[PDB]
Amino acid sequence: DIGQVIHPDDFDKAAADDYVLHEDGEKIYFLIKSKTDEYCFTNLALVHLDGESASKRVLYRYPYAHYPIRHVMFETAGTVDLDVEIKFEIGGKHYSIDVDKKQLEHVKDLYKALLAIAEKQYEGQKMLEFANSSLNHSVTILGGLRQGDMNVPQTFKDLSQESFDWLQGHYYKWNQKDFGSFYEKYIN
Amino acid sequence: DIGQVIHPDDFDKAAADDYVLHEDGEKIYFLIKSKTDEYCFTNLALVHLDGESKRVLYRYPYAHYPIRHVMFETAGTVDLDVEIKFEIGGKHYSIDVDKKQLEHVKDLYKALLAIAEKQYEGQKMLEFANSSLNHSVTILGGLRQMNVPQTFKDLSQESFDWLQGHYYKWNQKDFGSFYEKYIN
Amino acid sequence: DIGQVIHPDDFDKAAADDYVLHEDGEKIYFLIKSKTDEYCFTNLALVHLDGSKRVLYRYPYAHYPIRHVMFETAGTVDLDVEIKFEIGGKHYSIDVDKKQLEHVKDLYKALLAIAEKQYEGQKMLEFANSSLNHSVTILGGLRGDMNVPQTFKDLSQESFDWLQGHYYKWNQKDFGSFYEKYIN
Amino acid sequence: DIGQVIHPDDFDKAAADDYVLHEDGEKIYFLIKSKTDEYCFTNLALVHLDGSKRVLYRYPYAHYPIRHVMFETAGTVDLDVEIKFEIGGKHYSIDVDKKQLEHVKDLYKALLAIAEKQYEGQKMLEFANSSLNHSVTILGGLRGDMNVPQTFKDLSQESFDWLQGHYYKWNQKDFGSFYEKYIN
């Protein structure tokens, strides 16, 4: 069904705004409203109110951090067509959204934003891999040591921590939660 | 059966309050009462009085029964109820609530969604904690010389403290603040 | 058969009191008497007189864990409430006069707390054992000046103290404070 | 469909310019427009508008290597020259007005240079990885006074910097200097 890009002034009037986690500073950067669906793109997630009837709505929430964006596509309108179509996959779920060709200028900005998000996520997955591999190379290099001047239990504690910090630091660095700056950059 | 979000002032009047562990500081943050069921969300657990007039009492502490797949469904023009769904442990819960009180059920949705996420992230951290302990065991395998029996005691203790401490940190028991953040 | 929660002052008048180990400071915290059975919950065990012969059973908590603690209320037409649990692997369902619900709900809370402590203890045992092994691995083949035979003795004592100490800590025998907390 | 090499001053008038990431300093170095398609070669990617709908494709060089760059001149009777290449695995053949041969030959040279740099980089990656391993092997099991946990951290950073650094060096993103060298 064909959708309308909503202006920022009318975000608070949208059904989707009730499900935005304003409490956690979640902010709406792009909203497309159709007769049957509402697609809300925030700094943290895609909030989607799915109408599977020609009036009840199923609420979905896909935080980017747990549901990566991939295969971002765009399709323009011909002379005879009334809509432009934007596509992507979030987690593994396929999204195809038809939008009033009048608002192409705006949908093209979303296309750019999503494309940039997908890439940052992709690159992050590559860095996680190196992060883990580096952890192993240390384990292998440092295997089989001597006591010398060593407090064994303290050293055992501290070593467990270093490993933890590295696995953790990298997990949160390369699975970033917030992509507001990406919408900020292209939605201007 | 269609339920009513109960007001805080009427929590001590509810059948579920008798099964809340007031002795351990358990506090009710959300209660939905229907003609057949009673669903009590405390800081520590879901307490469910289930009718199929007898009531079967279930208790699902969050620490041992993780919340997953938190869903919400709104009311159409013709419908009288909004539905909140989730899985606690493996059990599927679907609770119909008076559409009039949507403002409150949406807050529960947000709370549950936040708990589920915290628990998910904690599971991943446990994996890191365990994997890290192995990496030290490997790096420190086969040594030199040291007071062997004192070292043996102390080293066993570190391992224990590490395993235990992480177990309790990432399987947190209390989620009161999550309800407090979205309800109040 | 529908039972009656007995009052503390009438404990010494029950058939079950003859089988409580007063000599070891065993104290009755809850007794349900029916026309056929007698269920006696002490700090150390469930003593059950099963029936006009009676077969005596004793299930010390330390050797028979309590699990799957449930509760079931009465309907308008029912005269009883039912408390259920498994002790060791044995299934118990005990019908009690709905008039005494306030008391049976307390037993429910206590047994629930007992069961959880036992479960958590079984996890701690696992960490305790796993830690022992991690020191064995780290301390594997060493070197260094040392009184080998004394160190061998002392080392064997440490391992014994660890294994033993944790065995007694996480298979605790006495749960009197649990009953005390919820029956009080 | 026979295309036209567009002049730099008319780049901002092409449909493709709307999809260039000016915000990240992406600059168009070569644009061929046909009645159905639009091929836009930037420092970072091939942007292709495929056709009155147009499907937008973007193939950043860093994720889609250019290979098998070919060229085909016009015969007396032909109106076009054809430039071919594979990007990722996708086959591209682009017919262009034989009048503009002088320009398409420059694109040919640039794409040829891009493709070679990418190939050579894939060999360097292989050496970079193989070298990492040779240090792991040489540095396998050591001894010596040492702050084990700091050394473990620092060591893990080095490996990360090596893996990362080489990843970015040999999968370079920007090939603007290549176009600049042959279109100038």
PDB file of N, CA and C in Angstrom, chain B residues 44-106:
ATOM      1  N   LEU B  44      10.634  -9.248  40.878  1.00  0.00           N
ATOM      2  CA  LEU B  44      11.335 -10.517  40.883  1.00  0.00           C
ATOM      3  C   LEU B  44      10.761 -11.551  39.963  1.00  0.00           C
ATOM      4  N   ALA B  45       9.472 -11.485  39.643  1.00  0.00           N
ATOM      5  CA  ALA B  45       8.843 -12.597  38.918  1.00  0.00           C
ATOM      6  C   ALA B  45       7.543 -12.216  38.266  1.00  0.00           C
ATOM      7  N   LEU B  46       7.027 -13.103  37.421  1.00  0.00           N
ATOM      8  CA  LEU B  46       5.604 -13.064  37.054  1.00  0.00           C
ATOM      9  C   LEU B  46       4.942 -14.094  37.984  1.00  0.00           C
ATOM     10  N   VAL B  47       3.889 -13.673  38.671  1.00  0.00           N
ATOM     11  CA  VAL B  47       3.099 -14.550  39.509  1.00  0.00           C
ATOM     12  C   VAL B  47       1.797 -14.632  38.750  1.00  0.00           C
ATOM     13  N   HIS B  48       1.361 -15.840  38.396  1.00  0.00           N
ATOM     14  CA  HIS B  48       0.140 -16.033  37.612  1.00  0.00           C
ATOM     15  C   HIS B  48      -0.854 -16.995  38.307  1.00  0.00           C
ATOM     16  N   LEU B  49      -2.034 -16.473  38.647  1.00  0.00           N
ATOM     17  CA  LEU B  49      -3.123 -17.276  39.163  1.00  0.00           C
ATOM     18  C   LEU B  49      -3.955 -17.681  37.963  1.00  0.00           C
ATOM     19  N   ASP B  50      -3.841 -18.938  37.556  1.00  0.00           N
ATOM     20  CA  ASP B  50      -4.482 -19.468  36.358  1.00  0.00           C
ATOM     21  C   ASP B  50      -5.788 -20.237  36.596  1.00  0.00           C
ATOM     22  N   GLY B  51      -6.866 -19.793  35.955  1.00  0.00           N
ATOM     23  CA  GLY B  51      -8.117 -20.546  35.915  1.00  0.00           C
ATOM     24  C   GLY B  51      -8.304 -21.187  34.537  1.00  0.00           C
ATOM     25  N   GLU B  52      -8.850 -22.406  34.520  1.00  0.00           N
ATOM     26  CA  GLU B  52      -9.139 -23.131  33.266  1.00  0.00           C
ATOM     27  C   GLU B  52     -10.617 -23.544  33.254  1.00  0.00           C
ATOM     28  N   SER B  53     -13.273 -22.436  38.858  1.00  0.00           N
ATOM     29  CA  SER B  53     -13.017 -21.407  39.882  1.00  0.00           C
ATOM     30  C   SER B  53     -11.693 -21.592  40.683  1.00  0.00           C
ATOM     31  N   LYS B  54     -11.187 -22.844  40.755  1.00  0.00           N
ATOM     32  CA  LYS B  54      -9.853 -23.152  41.324  1.00  0.00           C
ATOM     33  C   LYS B  54      -8.833 -22.306  40.581  1.00  0.00           C
ATOM     34  N   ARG B  55      -7.753 -21.952  41.249  1.00  0.00           N
ATOM     35  CA  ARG B  55      -6.705 -21.228  40.552  1.00  0.00           C
ATOM     36  C   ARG B  55      -5.416 -21.971  40.781  1.00  0.00           C
ATOM     37  N   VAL B  56      -4.663 -22.208  39.712  1.00  0.00           N
ATOM     38  CA  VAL B  56      -3.333 -22.799  39.816  1.00  0.00           C
ATOM     39  C   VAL B  56      -2.266 -21.693  39.873  1.00  0.00           C
ATOM     40  N   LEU B  57      -1.438 -21.706  40.915  1.00  0.00           N
ATOM     41  CA  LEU B  57      -0.418 -20.664  41.128  1.00  0.00           C
ATOM     42  C   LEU B  57       0.919 -21.010  40.500  1.00  0.00           C
ATOM     43  N   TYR B  58       1.355 -20.163  39.572  1.00  0.00           N
ATOM     44  CA  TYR B  58       2.663 -20.263  38.917  1.00  0.00           C
ATOM     45  C   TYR B  58       3.518 -19.102  39.336  1.00  0.00           C
ATOM     46  N   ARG B  59       4.812 -19.346  39.483  1.00  0.00           N
ATOM     47  CA  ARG B  59       5.761 -18.294  39.782  1.00  0.00           C
ATOM     48  C   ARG B  59       6.965 -18.520  38.889  1.00  0.00           C
ATOM     49  N   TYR B  60       7.329 -17.471  38.158  1.00  0.00           N
ATOM     50  CA  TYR B  60       8.411 -17.488  37.191  1.00  0.00           C
ATOM     51  C   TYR B  60       9.362 -16.345  37.528  1.00  0.00           C
ATOM     52  N   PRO B  61      10.308 -16.595  38.427  1.00  0.00           N
ATOM     53  CA  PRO B  61      11.320 -15.583  38.695  1.00  0.00           C
ATOM     54  C   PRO B  61      12.100 -15.264  37.427  1.00  0.00           C
ATOM     55  N   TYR B  62      12.370 -13.985  37.211  1.00  0.00           N
ATOM     56  CA  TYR B  62      13.004 -13.578  35.957  1.00  0.00           C
ATOM     57  C   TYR B  62      14.389 -14.215  35.820  1.00  0.00           C
ATOM     58  N   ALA B  63      15.097 -14.328  36.945  1.00  0.00           N
ATOM     59  CA  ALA B  63      16.421 -14.955  36.974  1.00  0.00           C
ATOM     60  C   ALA B  63      16.411 -16.357  36.399  1.00  0.00           C
ATOM     61  N   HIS B  64      15.362 -17.138  36.559  1.00  0.00           N
ATOM     62  CA  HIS B  64      15.382 -18.518  36.067  1.00  0.00           C
ATOM     63  C   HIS B  64      14.496 -18.721  34.840  1.00  0.00           C
ATOM     64  N   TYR B  65      13.680 -17.713  34.504  1.00  0.00           N
ATOM     65  CA  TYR B  65      12.755 -17.786  33.370  1.00  0.00           C
ATOM     66  C   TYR B  65      12.851 -16.502  32.554  1.00  0.00           C
ATOM     67  N   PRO B  66      13.719 -16.480  31.537  1.00  0.00           N
ATOM     68  CA  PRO B  66      13.935 -15.307  30.721  1.00  0.00           C
ATOM     69  C   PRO B  66      12.770 -14.917  29.827  1.00  0.00           C
ATOM     70  N   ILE B  67      12.552 -13.607  29.735  1.00  0.00           N
ATOM     71  CA  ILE B  67      11.503 -13.077  28.881  1.00  0.00           C
ATOM     72  C   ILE B  67      12.063 -12.909  27.479  1.00  0.00           C
ATOM     73  N   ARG B  68      11.266 -13.362  26.512  1.00  0.00           N
ATOM     74  CA  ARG B  68      11.613 -13.304  25.101  1.00  0.00           C
ATOM     75  C   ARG B  68      10.395 -12.998  24.227  1.00  0.00           C
ATOM     76  N   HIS B  69      10.639 -12.470  23.032  1.00  0.00           N
ATOM     77  CA  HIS B  69       9.604 -12.286  22.017  1.00  0.00           C
ATOM     78  C   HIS B  69       8.448 -11.436  22.480  1.00  0.00           C
ATOM     79  N   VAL B  70       8.780 -10.297  23.067  1.00  0.00           N
ATOM     80  CA  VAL B  70       7.764  -9.394  23.538  1.00  0.00           C
ATOM     81  C   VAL B  70       7.076  -8.733  22.331  1.00  0.00           C
ATOM     82  N   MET B  71       5.768  -8.971  22.221  1.00  0.00           N
ATOM     83  CA  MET B  71       4.900  -8.444  21.154  1.00  0.00           C
ATOM     84  C   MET B  71       3.706  -7.678  21.703  1.00  0.00           C
ATOM     85  N   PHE B  72       3.203  -6.764  20.882  1.00  0.00           N
ATOM     86  CA  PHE B  72       2.006  -6.009  21.202  1.00  0.00           C
ATOM     87  C   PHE B  72       1.089  -5.942  19.994  1.00  0.00           C
ATOM     88  N   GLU B  73      -0.207  -5.873  20.270  1.00  0.00           N
ATOM     89  CA  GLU B  73      -1.226  -5.794  19.232  1.00  0.00           C
ATOM     90  C   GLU B  73      -2.314  -4.832  19.701  1.00  0.00           C
ATOM     91  N   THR B  74      -2.595  -3.820  18.880  1.00  0.00           N
ATOM     92  CA  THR B  74      -3.585  -2.776  19.196  1.00  0.00           C
ATOM     93  C   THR B  74      -5.013  -3.209  18.846  1.00  0.00           C
ATOM     94  N   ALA B  75      -5.973  -2.363  19.211  1.00  0.00           N
ATOM     95  CA  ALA B  75      -7.379  -2.627  18.941  1.00  0.00           C
ATOM     96  C   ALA B  75      -7.833  -1.926  17.668  1.00  0.00           C
ATOM     97  N   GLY B  76      -8.673  -2.596  16.883  1.00  0.00           N
ATOM     98  CA  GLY B  76      -9.313  -1.966  15.725  1.00  0.00           C
ATOM     99  C   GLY B  76     -10.524  -1.171  16.188  1.00  0.00           C
ATOM    100  N   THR B  77     -11.247  -0.587  15.231  1.00  0.00           N
ATOM    101  CA  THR B  77     -12.475   0.148  15.544  1.00  0.00           C
ATOM    102  C   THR B  77     -13.454  -0.784  16.267  1.00  0.00           C
ATOM    103  N   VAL B  78     -13.596  -2.004  15.741  1.00  0.00           N
ATOM    104  CA  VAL B  78     -14.568  -3.002  16.246  1.00  0.00           C
ATOM    105  C   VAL B  78     -14.154  -3.808  17.490  1.00  0.00           C
ATOM    106  N   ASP B  79     -12.861  -3.824  17.813  1.00  0.00           N
ATOM    107  CA  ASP B  79     -12.339  -4.633  18.928  1.00  0.00           C
ATOM    108  C   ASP B  79     -12.444  -3.942  20.287  1.00  0.00           C
ATOM    109  N   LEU B  80     -12.567  -4.740  21.343  1.00  0.00           N
ATOM    110  CA  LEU B  80     -12.606  -4.228  22.726  1.00  0.00           C
ATOM    111  C   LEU B  80     -11.292  -4.435  23.523  1.00  0.00           C
ATOM    112  N   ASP B  81     -10.318  -5.115  22.914  1.00  0.00           N
ATOM    113  CA  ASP B  81      -9.084  -5.454  23.597  1.00  0.00           C
ATOM    114  C   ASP B  81      -7.788  -5.230  22.816  1.00  0.00           C
ATOM    115  N   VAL B  82      -6.733  -4.969  23.582  1.00  0.00           N
ATOM    116  CA  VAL B  82      -5.375  -4.912  23.083  1.00  0.00           C
ATOM    117  C   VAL B  82      -4.728  -6.162  23.672  1.00  0.00           C
ATOM    118  N   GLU B  83      -3.823  -6.789  22.933  1.00  0.00           N
ATOM    119  CA  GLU B  83      -3.175  -8.026  23.363  1.00  0.00           C
ATOM    120  C   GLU B  83      -1.672  -7.807  23.540  1.00  0.00           C
ATOM    121  N   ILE B  84      -1.147  -8.231  24.687  1.00  0.00           N
ATOM    122  CA  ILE B  84       0.297  -8.257  24.918  1.00  0.00           C
ATOM    123  C   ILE B  84       0.753  -9.718  24.973  1.00  0.00           C
ATOM    124  N   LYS B  85       1.827 -10.016  24.244  1.00  0.00           N
ATOM    125  CA  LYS B  85       2.400 -11.355  24.195  1.00  0.00           C
ATOM    126  C   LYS B  85       3.869 -11.327  24.566  1.00  0.00           C
ATOM    127  N   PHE B  86       4.328 -12.484  25.038  1.00  0.00           N
ATOM    128  CA  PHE B  86       5.717 -12.732  25.402  1.00  0.00           C
ATOM    129  C   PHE B  86       5.876 -14.202  25.784  1.00  0.00           C
ATOM    130  N   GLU B  87       7.120 -14.653  25.864  1.00  0.00           N
ATOM    131  CA  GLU B  87       7.441 -15.983  26.349  1.00  0.00           C
ATOM    132  C   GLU B  87       8.299 -15.825  27.590  1.00  0.00           C
ATOM    133  N   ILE B  88       7.918 -16.547  28.639  1.00  0.00           N
ATOM    134  CA  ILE B  88       8.644 -16.549  29.906  1.00  0.00           C
ATOM    135  C   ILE B  88       9.054 -17.997  30.152  1.00  0.00           C
ATOM    136  N   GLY B  89      10.364 -18.224  30.251  1.00  0.00           N
ATOM    137  CA  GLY B  89      10.889 -19.578  30.146  1.00  0.00           C
ATOM    138  C   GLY B  89      10.469 -19.971  28.735  1.00  0.00           C
ATOM    139  N   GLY B  90       9.879 -21.139  28.570  1.00  0.00           N
ATOM    140  CA  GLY B  90       9.420 -21.466  27.229  1.00  0.00           C
ATOM    141  C   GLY B  90       7.960 -21.162  27.021  1.00  0.00           C
ATOM    142  N   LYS B  91       7.275 -20.796  28.100  1.00  0.00           N
ATOM    143  CA  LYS B  91       5.825 -20.714  28.086  1.00  0.00           C
ATOM    144  C   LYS B  91       5.321 -19.470  27.349  1.00  0.00           C
ATOM    145  N   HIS B  92       4.329 -19.668  26.480  1.00  0.00           N
ATOM    146  CA  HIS B  92       3.728 -18.603  25.685  1.00  0.00           C
ATOM    147  C   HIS B  92       2.605 -17.932  26.443  1.00  0.00           C
ATOM    148  N   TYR B  93       2.683 -16.610  26.602  1.00  0.00           N
ATOM    149  CA  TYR B  93       1.662 -15.815  27.287  1.00  0.00           C
ATOM    150  C   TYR B  93       1.024 -14.829  26.332  1.00  0.00           C
ATOM    151  N   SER B  94      -0.304 -14.793  26.315  1.00  0.00           N
ATOM    152  CA  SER B  94      -1.034 -13.844  25.484  1.00  0.00           C
ATOM    153  C   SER B  94      -2.152 -13.299  26.357  1.00  0.00           C
ATOM    154  N   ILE B  95      -2.096 -12.009  26.670  1.00  0.00           N
ATOM    155  CA  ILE B  95      -2.999 -11.417  27.647  1.00  0.00           C
ATOM    156  C   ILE B  95      -3.815 -10.321  26.993  1.00  0.00           C
ATOM    157  N   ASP B  96      -5.135 -10.509  26.963  1.00  0.00           N
ATOM    158  CA  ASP B  96      -6.056  -9.510  26.415  1.00  0.00           C
ATOM    159  C   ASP B  96      -6.459  -8.488  27.476  1.00  0.00           C
ATOM    160  N   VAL B  97      -6.368  -7.200  27.138  1.00  0.00           N
ATOM    161  CA  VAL B  97      -6.614  -6.122  28.091  1.00  0.00           C
ATOM    162  C   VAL B  97      -7.579  -5.066  27.518  1.00  0.00           C
ATOM    163  N   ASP B  98      -8.414  -4.514  28.394  1.00  0.00           N
ATOM    164  CA  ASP B  98      -9.380  -3.481  28.023  1.00  0.00           C
ATOM    165  C   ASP B  98      -8.693  -2.379  27.208  1.00  0.00           C
ATOM    166  N   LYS B  99      -9.146  -2.165  25.967  1.00  0.00           N
ATOM    167  CA  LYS B  99      -8.528  -1.153  25.089  1.00  0.00           C
ATOM    168  C   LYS B  99      -8.538   0.224  25.735  1.00  0.00           C
ATOM    169  N   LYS B 100      -9.457   0.459  26.664  1.00  0.00           N
ATOM    170  CA  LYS B 100      -9.500   1.736  27.364  1.00  0.00           C
ATOM    171  C   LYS B 100      -8.181   2.022  28.091  1.00  0.00           C
ATOM    172  N   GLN B 101      -7.525   0.983  28.576  1.00  0.00           N
ATOM    173  CA  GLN B 101      -6.295   1.169  29.338  1.00  0.00           C
ATOM    174  C   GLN B 101      -5.020   0.993  28.529  1.00  0.00           C
ATOM    175  N   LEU B 102      -5.106   1.144  27.207  1.00  0.00           N
ATOM    176  CA  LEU B 102      -3.948   1.045  26.308  1.00  0.00           C
ATOM    177  C   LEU B 102      -2.713   1.810  26.799  1.00  0.00           C
ATOM    178  N   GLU B 103      -2.906   3.021  27.329  1.00  0.00           N
ATOM    179  CA  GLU B 103      -1.789   3.845  27.820  1.00  0.00           C
ATOM    180  C   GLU B 103      -0.916   3.081  28.832  1.00  0.00           C
ATOM    181  N   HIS B 104      -1.539   2.205  29.613  1.00  0.00           N
ATOM    182  CA  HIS B 104      -0.832   1.422  30.636  1.00  0.00           C
ATOM    183  C   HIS B 104      -0.185   0.143  30.091  1.00  0.00           C
ATOM    184  N   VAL B 105      -0.903  -0.562  29.218  1.00  0.00           N
ATOM    185  CA  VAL B 105      -0.400  -1.790  28.594  1.00  0.00           C
ATOM    186  C   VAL B 105       0.788  -1.512  27.667  1.00  0.00           C
ATOM    187  N   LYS B 106       0.848  -0.308  27.105  1.00  0.00           N
ATOM    188  CA  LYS B 106       1.958   0.073  26.252  1.00  0.00           C
ATOM    189  C   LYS B 106       3.197   0.256  27.124  1.00  0.00           C
TER     190      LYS B 106
END
